Design a protein around this ligand. Structure first.
Ligand SMILES: *C[C@@](*)(O)[C@H](CCCCN)NS(=O)(=O)c1ccc(C)cc1
Ligand SMILES: *C[C@@](*)(O)[C@H](CCCCN)NS(=O)(=O)c1ccc(C)cc1
Ligand SMILES: [Ca+2]
Ligand SMILES: [Ca+2]
Ligand SMILES: [Cl-]
Ligand SMILES: [Cl-]
Lengths: 264, 265
């Protein structure tokens, strides 16, 4: 696929500290059309349930739509194309051969733009998946990392090396979103990246991409994005079908944050 | 309620040409909290069905939430506060006494950020409602008018006097949205305005507010917004639960645009 040249192929050295959670992120189609990003999340039972977090606005919100979605793992460029280069802006060489079809909707809620699906098919060990940890604490972090499929193209990584802020969407009054500021010439996010995770420095999901002003041409404060917070989605709309808590902590261990779980 | 001072009270002279469709627009609450804007739309049978168009992102998409929503009619400042004035930015004197409760979801689709509800309670003639026309044709217009409840506060009007553009949301590649550019010192839209209609110069709904960069301090290209298009929502997700066509033209007359219907007719 094709995305903005300023983006950074996950295989680049910028991915050296994220070789586990890179394997949590997938691209997916909706009714046959490549559509959005999501990612695999661990739960407090460490049981490999195929909980797959994405964005409500992507519309994977009905049993019918979830039933026909196709999830594509390990879709990324084989080599590190120099960020900013014509090559990086060109069609990549990623494979879409490792896929699975079908899911059910466990929960969804508009306010933090989240959807939690459970994929029908158990993880194929051959795909070498990773179930990422999460952190639902009410706090900002000193930096963060996005792993995402911009334009639903090959997987990219984008780093933020400044503090997050808590706000509503687009900086409105609120606490539903984490506002993440990208580096002046670093990777950003694009339509198609929605639903992609933002990770804390300890590699725990804090939220998933809703949207924002960033693009490769964006400058200043516009080079930033908003993620619907796990903190907010945890309690969500106050029912099991509108929040994360019943799924990510079904046993009720009271975990405020957990680590990831590897296929191995 | 309180909203940005650059906004324009509907009772101002700026509303002189919209005294009908002003009466289509309402504010509503979600699980008790003032939440978003919607508006009443006519259908090809001219039968006063309480079809109420709003935004999918407002989350009025489940039976439970639709059942407990409260819709507030005729919530506006009694006098024209000068746009840009401290008065305009202050709490208004609108009333929330004329309301009704409950609806069902007829259709919703994320791509054009639309939800079509049908309110449970038939129109109260005393409320003096108007069911706006609509226009599903695939085209831009030379200008447009928004009527909305910014911050779910008193009703305001915002005029665009330049051409609309067709794009995806936030100017992305696509045709799902109408991009509307506001006047340098004119009214804008704000969170809470979502779901509010954009009207063609002929006062027909073309779409409902999704979002965008505008605010009272926004400048140039940022002083603009994106509306999910009726044209797009008409066909929607290809089923009656994901599109407008089955509801707004149940009879299958083939209407490409219709005019409004007043309470007095
Ligand atoms: C849906 C997501 O892929 C995008 C991500 C944009 C990232 C830009 N830096 N979100 S969105 O805001 O563009 C959006 C929201 C709602 C709908 C219906 C479409 C697109
Ligand atoms: C939901 C709407 O009230 C707002 C309107 C903002 C208009 C700014 N000029 N839309 S939004 O884009 O800010 C938005 C979208 C999704 C969610 C969950 C919240 C807010
Ligand atoms: Ca508010
Ligand atoms: Ca039908
Ligand atoms: Cl695309
Ligand atoms: Cl949205």
């Amino acid at each position: 696929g094709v995305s903005g040249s300023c983006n950074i192929d996950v295989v680049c050295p910028e991915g050296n500290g994220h070789r586990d959670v890179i394997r949590s992120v997938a691209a997916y189609s909706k009714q046959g059309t490549m559509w959005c990003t999501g990612s695999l999340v661990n739960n407090s039972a460490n049981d490999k349930k195929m909980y797959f977090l994405t964005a409500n606005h992507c519309g994977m919100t009905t049993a019918a739509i979830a039933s026909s979605m196709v999830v594509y793992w390990n879709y990324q460029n084989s080599t590190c194309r120099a960020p900013g280069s014509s090559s990086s802006g060109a069609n990549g060489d990623g494979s879409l051969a490792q896929s699975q079809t079908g899911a059910v909707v466990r929960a969804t809620n508009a306010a933090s733009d989240f959807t939690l699906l459970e994929l029908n098919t158990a993880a194929n060990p051959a795909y070498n998946l990773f179930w990422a940890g999460w952190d639902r604490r009410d706090q900002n972090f000193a930096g963060a990392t996005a792993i995402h499929h911009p334009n639903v193209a090959e997987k990219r990584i984008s780093h933020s090396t400044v503090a997050t802020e808590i706000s509503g969407y687009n900086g409105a009054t609120g606490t539903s979103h984490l506002h993440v500021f990208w580096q002046a010439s670093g990777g950003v996010t694009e339509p198609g990246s929605s639903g992609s995770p933002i990770y804390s420095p300890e590699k725990r999901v804090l939220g998933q991409l809703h949207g924002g002003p960033s693009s490769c041409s964006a400058t200043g404060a516009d080079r930033s994005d908003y993620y619907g917070r796990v903190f907010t989605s945890w309690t969500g709309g106050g029912t099991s079908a509108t929040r994360l808590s019943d799924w990510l902590d079904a046993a009720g261990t009271g975990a405020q944050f957990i680590d990831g779980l590897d296929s191995t």
